[PDB]
Scaffold this active site. Sequence first.
Site, PDB file in Angstrom:
ATOM      1  N   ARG F 368       0.821  -1.205   0.000  1.00 40.19           N
ATOM      2  CA  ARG F 368       0.000   0.000   0.000  1.00 40.19           C
ATOM      3  C   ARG F 368       0.857   1.257   0.000  1.00 40.19           C
ATOM      4  O   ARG F 368       0.522   2.241  -0.670  1.00 40.19           O
ATOM      5  CB  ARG F 368      -0.940   0.012   1.200  1.00 40.19           C
ATOM      6  CG  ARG F 368      -2.248  -0.722   0.981  1.00 40.19           C
ATOM      7  CD  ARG F 368      -2.134  -2.144   1.422  1.00 40.19           C
ATOM      8  NE  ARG F 368      -3.430  -2.797   1.574  1.00 40.19           N
ATOM      9  CZ  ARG F 368      -3.981  -3.611   0.681  1.00 40.19           C
ATOM     10  NH1 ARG F 368      -3.359  -3.894  -0.455  1.00 40.19           N
ATOM     11  NH2 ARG F 368      -5.162  -4.152   0.936  1.00 40.19           N
TER      12      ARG F 368
HETATM   13  N1  LIG Z   1      -7.771   3.960  -8.106  1.00 43.13           N
HETATM   14  C1  LIG Z   1      -6.675   3.177  -8.006  1.00 43.13           C
HETATM   15  N2  LIG Z   1      -5.658   3.285  -8.879  1.00 43.13           N
HETATM   16  C2  LIG Z   1      -4.558   2.514  -8.800  1.00 43.13           C
HETATM   17  N3  LIG Z   1      -4.383   1.584  -7.850  1.00 43.13           N
HETATM   18  C3  LIG Z   1      -5.326   1.368  -6.908  1.00 43.13           C
HETATM   19  C4  LIG Z   1      -6.549   2.173  -6.936  1.00 43.13           C
HETATM   20  N4  LIG Z   1      -7.301   1.763  -5.907  1.00 43.13           N
HETATM   21  C5  LIG Z   1      -6.624   0.781  -5.269  1.00 43.13           C
HETATM   22  N5  LIG Z   1      -5.446   0.550  -5.865  1.00 43.13           N
HETATM   23  C6  LIG Z   1      -4.462  -0.464  -5.428  1.00 43.13           C
HETATM   24  O1  LIG Z   1      -4.997  -1.159  -4.306  1.00 43.13           O
HETATM   25  C7  LIG Z   1      -4.207  -0.941  -3.142  1.00 43.13           C
HETATM   26  C8  LIG Z   1      -5.087  -0.387  -2.040  1.00 43.13           C
HETATM   27  O2  LIG Z   1      -6.231  -1.209  -1.912  1.00 43.13           O
HETATM   28  P1  LIG Z   1      -7.343  -0.848  -0.825  1.00 43.13           P
HETATM   29  O3  LIG Z   1      -8.534  -0.307  -1.553  1.00 43.13           O
HETATM   30  O4  LIG Z   1      -6.705  -0.050   0.275  1.00 43.13           O
HETATM   31  O5  LIG Z   1      -7.689  -2.312  -0.266  1.00 43.13           O
HETATM   32  P2  LIG Z   1      -9.168  -2.758   0.153  1.00 43.13           P
HETATM   33  O6  LIG Z   1     -10.012  -2.292  -0.999  1.00 43.13           O
HETATM   34  O7  LIG Z   1      -9.040  -4.250   0.248  1.00 43.13           O
HETATM   35  O8  LIG Z   1      -9.433  -2.065   1.460  1.00 43.13           O
HETATM   36  C9  LIG Z   1      -3.103   0.030  -3.490  1.00 43.13           C
HETATM   37  O9  LIG Z   1      -1.833  -0.495  -3.113  1.00 43.13           O
HETATM   38  C10 LIG Z   1      -3.180   0.208  -4.986  1.00 43.13           C
HETATM   39  O10 LIG Z   1      -2.066  -0.419  -5.625  1.00 43.13           O
END
Ligand SMILES: Nc1ncnc2c1ncn2[C@@H]1O[C@H](COP(=O)(O)OP(=O)(O)O)[C@@H](O)[C@H]1O
Lengths: 48, 62, 188, 467, 469, 498
Positions: F368
């Site tokens: 992340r």
């Molecule tokens: N809009 C986006 N653009 C690029 N990468 C994204 C985007 N949203 C999420 N990610 C990827 O997903 C990861 C974060 O996911 P996250 O949404 O925090 O997990 P969860 O949805 O399981 O809570 C980041 O490390 C990133 O690489």
Amino acid sequence: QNMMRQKEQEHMINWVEKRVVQSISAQQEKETIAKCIADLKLLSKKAQ
Amino acid sequence: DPVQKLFVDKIREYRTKRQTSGGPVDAGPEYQQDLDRELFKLKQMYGKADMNTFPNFTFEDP
Amino acid sequence: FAKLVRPPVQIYGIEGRYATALYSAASKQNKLEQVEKELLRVGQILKEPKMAASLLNPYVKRSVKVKSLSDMTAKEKFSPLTSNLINLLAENGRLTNTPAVISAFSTMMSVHRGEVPCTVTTASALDEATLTELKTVLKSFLSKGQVLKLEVKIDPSIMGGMIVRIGEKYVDMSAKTKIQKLSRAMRE
Amino acid sequence: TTGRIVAVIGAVVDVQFDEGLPPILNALEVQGRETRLVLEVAQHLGESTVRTIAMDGTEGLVRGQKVLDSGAPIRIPVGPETLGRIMNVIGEPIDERGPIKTKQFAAIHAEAPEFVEMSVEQEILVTGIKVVDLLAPYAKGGKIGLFGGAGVGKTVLIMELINNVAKAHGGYSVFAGVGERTREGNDLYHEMIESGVINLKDATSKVALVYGQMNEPPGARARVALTGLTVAEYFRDQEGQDVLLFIDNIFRFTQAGSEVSALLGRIPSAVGYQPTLATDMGTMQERITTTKKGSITSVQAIYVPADDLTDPAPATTFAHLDATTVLSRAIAELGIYPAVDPLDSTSRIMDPNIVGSEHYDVARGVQKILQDYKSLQDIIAILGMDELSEEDKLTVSRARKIQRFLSQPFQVAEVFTGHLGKLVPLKETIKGFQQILAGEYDHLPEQAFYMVGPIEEAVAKADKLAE
Amino acid sequence: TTGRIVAVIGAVVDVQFDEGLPPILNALEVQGRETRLVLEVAQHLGESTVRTIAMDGTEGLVRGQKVLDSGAPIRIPVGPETLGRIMNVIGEPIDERGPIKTKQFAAIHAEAPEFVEMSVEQEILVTGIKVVDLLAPYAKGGKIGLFGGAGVGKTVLIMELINNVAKAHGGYSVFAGVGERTREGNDLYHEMIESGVINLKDATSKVALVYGQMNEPPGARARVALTGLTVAEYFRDQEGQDVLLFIDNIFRFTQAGSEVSALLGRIPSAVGYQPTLATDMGTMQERITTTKKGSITSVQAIYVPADDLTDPAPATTFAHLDATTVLSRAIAELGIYPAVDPLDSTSRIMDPNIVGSEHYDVARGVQKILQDYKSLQDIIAILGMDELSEEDKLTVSRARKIQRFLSQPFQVAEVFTGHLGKLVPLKETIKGFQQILAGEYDHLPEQAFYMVGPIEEAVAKADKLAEEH
Amino acid sequence: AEVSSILEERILGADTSVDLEETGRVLSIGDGIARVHGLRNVQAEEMVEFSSGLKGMSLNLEPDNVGVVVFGNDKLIKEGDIVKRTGAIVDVPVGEELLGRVVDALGNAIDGKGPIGSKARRRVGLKAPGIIPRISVREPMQTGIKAVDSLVPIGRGQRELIIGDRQTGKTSIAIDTIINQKRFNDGTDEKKKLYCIYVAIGQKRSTVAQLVKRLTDADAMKYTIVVSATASDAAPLQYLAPYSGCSMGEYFRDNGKHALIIYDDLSKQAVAYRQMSLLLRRPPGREAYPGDVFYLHSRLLERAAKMNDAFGGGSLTALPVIETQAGDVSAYIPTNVISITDGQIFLETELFYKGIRPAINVGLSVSRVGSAAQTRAMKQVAGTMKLELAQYREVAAFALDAATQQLLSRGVRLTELLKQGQYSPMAIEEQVAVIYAGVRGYLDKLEPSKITKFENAFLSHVISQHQALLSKIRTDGKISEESDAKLKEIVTNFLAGF
Ligand SMILES: Nc1ncnc2c1ncn2[C@@H]1O[C@H](COP(=O)(O)OP(=O)(O)O)[C@@H](O)[C@H]1O
Ligand SMILES: Nc1ncnc2c1ncn2[C@@H]1O[C@H](COP(=O)(O)OP(=O)(O)OP(=O)(O)O)[C@@H](O)[C@H]1O
Ligand SMILES: Nc1ncnc2c1ncn2[C@@H]1O[C@H](COP(=O)(O)OP(=O)(O)O)[C@@H](O)[C@H]1O
Ligand SMILES: [Mg+2]
Ligand SMILES: [Mg+2]
Ligand SMILES: [Mg+2]
């Protein structure tokens, strides 16, 4: 040298614990009970 | 501190052992057998070199 | 529900619940001593080999058991509390653990009259004078009005000294534990 | 002391001592039996009762029967007088040759070596088996595990290893057969008697046998691994020697536990298994280590239930081994033997700093080509081997040649197939696989490598095929 | 009333009362703790004992510890003074800024609105996200779900929504972080302070935060959702105003309920879930509603364990939501972000009579072309692209262009992509997709459409790609 | 002579004091769980002691008895024994005195080498730091693996997860991370020194001995603690070892220093906890794990924080190691820990045998923090490398035109660039040099089977001739224009000269 130190250590340990377990059979009852009852009295005094 | 009769008892037994430690007392054959076994094992794990002094080299040029 | 008066020492289990019910029932109406005496009586009454053989057979109907116990209670002129307790234990089929209920109530009444069981362990026996000073000091441990209930076992497994239990309090002036302590600390 | 039986459920007996209670693991003798029935204590239930596991059939035990405390855990005879003998759980000879005369007994429930005793040495043990020696090289003094379902080659492989390794072994050896066929134990006994490894009329026997075979109750199968462990621990610690310890089958040690766990009133784990599976396996398996006082080279045959490697038992055992050897039923169905799966098998000493650079490079090349073939297999199965590029066809051909070449004829299978047993020194194995990998033998038929020794035998076979 | 701990097993404490018992759901305070430990009554076991779940660590509890009965459920501070603050389940502040000085305390347990209070009006909520606006348009006052496994974009998407809707939203807002990483809680606190929705100096804060993160014992995670819901409910009713309510995740409420059920004596259900899963979730999701007195727009992130949409928890949650946007890992692997699955997302307002016939027809055309593309992918696995009917290749090209054009760069995902965030008005999204379907762009390459805003940006990106060709 | 003297020195100082202590009688002991009766004032998860000096934890407080778990062997506890309450929640020694010492789950020295001189104790079950103390992850945690430092970077205060099957190279990544910190710990500035803690759960003592000797060979025990709760250690110890190690690291992060902790594995702590819970009679859950199996880990991995500068500024990175079954990441504990942690590092056997070692599956591995917690040079180069591999992975399943042929060529060159050996972590500037050479079309001329030869020879050449350039890159922390021009000329010269 370290192995001699530790091995003579362990032999020391065993010898001494034996000697003490034979010795403790000695006649010290009356005195031991006296001192232990004294200790009980002191512990009671702190208790309250 | 002079009251823990077993404290002074253990100290006394220790002193007696100190005096009697001219040769490992109550050693029994197990003492020698072990000593030999683990000395032998250490000798293998280290090496068989000349166990008094510095061995010589006589290196070789390229 | 009726706010039952809690016993001093909480006994747990089936015997605990029956004994706590009995203690709460007796504490109001103030019949604890008489009911304890009646419990000790039924301790022997049911123990009779004929009665015991007739009450440990689950093929005599609960009706017959209750009738026999009612007859015995009437023949012994008990308090209504003890008669009802025996009837209740008989209806629920809890006769096989009646002695457990009597033992529980005995433990519960002993604490009611202020007793703290005690234990003393030594390699050998004691001279009565030393036991007298032990009585005195241990009574020093207790609170006001708390009678003591001494028990002096003799454990030669320990190499000497003394071991004292007063309720949950524990003091170990025994040779064996001190030998162990020195051997361990010295080994480190 | 003296207690009385109060409950007898299966192999689990409850004994009530009004006088002093016996500690845990302490053994008791049921007084009044034709033979010796030993009850190992396992729990204190309160009310002065102890639950125990019976080391023999419990039929005929009467509630109220008398049980006499023995004061110490099951103590077995250990020494150089237990070589050439056959023992059982409680140390009683079962070869009908007289009492095992030793001056020194060992309790089977000792503790594992401390941390300051482990040895970090890592050598290589050559077994003369191409697949084992190339991809999963066994190590001297380490733990080895042969994982495999039913009828894939665990016992044939372990007998081949016995033959090879323990013929070239100057040290002692200990075979603990826990939960396996009794006729297999008899065949082993007579093979050793014939092969000179046991002298019934001398004192030059080099194998001690222990046997808790499948016909015995769960309580005997559970605690028969510990007897072999003790017999080996003596030859390691005291005699200060290098021991071989073959166990077959160690799964039956955990299985037996789950048979008594149910009766001990314990909540079952993932699949009916006792809640204490990993702890018991750990306490057993950490006594088989090679410490500074000696060496134990333990080989354990491990049974995979329903061919399920996800099962708790093999999955837990995997973490207690240096080298593994996962025999596979598919490979055995292809005719390959030993059926070792080259990709599941692993080893700790598969390190370029231990085996070399040619050995390591060859092993990794073989594994890479086999993995590529495995990747292609799904398409090859449906679309056919015609929808493949030329590099892919070359990979398929080399991978099949290598798969066949890893097969070897054992001497213990001379009776099965009539072939001649073959040993393949390590250098020959490495050279042959180097040649196959480089493509030196792309003109031969793949069935020229099936069940041969060194590669030159493959070339001779290919020439004979031309005729 | 005063009672007395009689058992402590994990997070479940059994408390015995000599006087009258306390009613179920009451809060009890343990006496003798340096901090504040609050137990909540969950059962009456008879014999004057009550079982309770502790809202804090039960370490250092002693059999016999006295307990006070507050007489009411957990009452949290509510009002305009909670804005810009942070809170526990029990309402005490955890922002190290002093006491929350309100005049109103609200109990976290309340009955759901009755049927005679439901609003039946729906109007699109334009979020500025192409996929959401086109295929699963949201609605003011409606409950939104964001399903998806781990690592698909739930938190990023919810942060993006807070960036867009909350920043330019007149009414208040509430964020209840339920059983999520504390790192993310701190990151959100600081991002909000930077943006300005949380003002530490004045009294102009527009967001109230409640945190029950995953270091808390199950009792606190199972109730922080109710605390945030209570704050939102007060802002809905008394303030008589629009509210937003973001929750992340509302699967940790269910899971925390499952971690204590076995210790409360309940037999488990289908897959290690409590028997009361649906009822427990309903008694909460039924207070997050747009009554006729106020209006809560609820956005919920819903963890889907192991991408399994048929798990009992997400499966049950599906029925409580108006709009859903099922983020998919199979689409996030392709690099299409947000990974919203166009075929697995739905909305209630997605009808021709609510959005319009143009919007509806564009959405349905996109969905149909994507489904046809999925059907074709099976054939391409055997034939190959070179052997398709010259009409099919057109379908595949349109489908890939549409698949890429749904991707969009967020203003909060600058760190990952490095690009710049774009907000696309609804008319521009409809125009873009209508044109892509109509064939007005069947010459531009696919990659021109990847991670751009309106369609003209795709044209410009294609022009740049051609110039540096 | 002096051997007995130092022996006496121990007795000379003893524990005379005998106090009046509360007690209880062991109603029932079996399977490692005792049911004490008494101990009316014993706390929850307090430490009690048995008549033989053996410790235990009072985990269950039932009305009629206290369920105690024994921290050790169980054969020595009888019925009617005596359990004395020590009046102290379970706690472990902490301090720099533990560095270089192998200790058991309870902080007892395990390698001989005398006792621990710790002056302070910390409770294992401490709450995680709040929301306010923390601060976003800023510094990079230098792991030494090219594929981890470039494609899935780890910051300080992050909680990566190393998840894979058995024997794919997880402990190898952990050991490389531990060994790499030697260069920073040997230097002068204390803002880079990272003290490492390795919790070994369920591993056989031989494995931990091999690991400890490996660390000693690399001279990496100066700053490493090893908390070993091996397979033969009762389940209450394998359940508690992670928390002991996490407390030993909490001390560092609370005293302005930086720490790294490596639980290995957590899938065995889960099993030990399940055994404990099943032997206390608590009802089972899914796959027989207790209900509180997520909590077990979430409360443990939430202690790896990154304190702000008001709370010292210290940090505690965590690298839990999970073990899946045949790649079934969808299992119970794997999914729990994946939804707990920040990043992930997926190791795959299909990649391990295909020659890609470390097997890191860069396609699925995530972090992340990403951009943040990466040096500027690595940020510049690894970005283009990430794009190139992302494009390559799409068109890879086959093997025409010049553009896509060169795309595959570049992808393969980068792939063989990322391979690595064991216990040979690279300095970050060296990684930058290698990745820069590979990604700037230089290696596209070479064969892909020779890329390892290049990598190695280029490293050996640069480490001696151009130490100054590497020092420049490290100190300035970016590929400046002059640094880029140099790198360009060095690579151009070396490529032809090879
Ligand atoms: N809009 C986006 N653009 C690029 N990468 C994204 C985007 N949203 C999420 N990610 C990827 O997903 C990861 C974060 O996911 P996250 O949404 O925090 O997990 P969860 O949805 O399981 O809570 C980041 O490390 C990133 O690489
Ligand atoms: N980068 C690498 N290069 C070459 N070999 C490697 C590499 N990484 C790991 N290995 C090999 O993989 C084997 C297993 O390594 P490691 O112990 O790190 O994996 P593991 O999954 O922790 O094993 P286990 O889980 O069984 O403890 C080692 O024998 C080692 O030789
Ligand atoms: N080297 C070999 N040559 C031929 N067959 C073999 C060989 N090794 C094993 N087998 C096959 O394995 C079978 C024996 O299986 P075995 O290993 O005894 O069962 P288990 O796996 O239960 O021990 C034989 O019938 C034989 O077909
Ligand atoms: Mg067999
Ligand atoms: Mg999230
Ligand atoms: Mg490992």
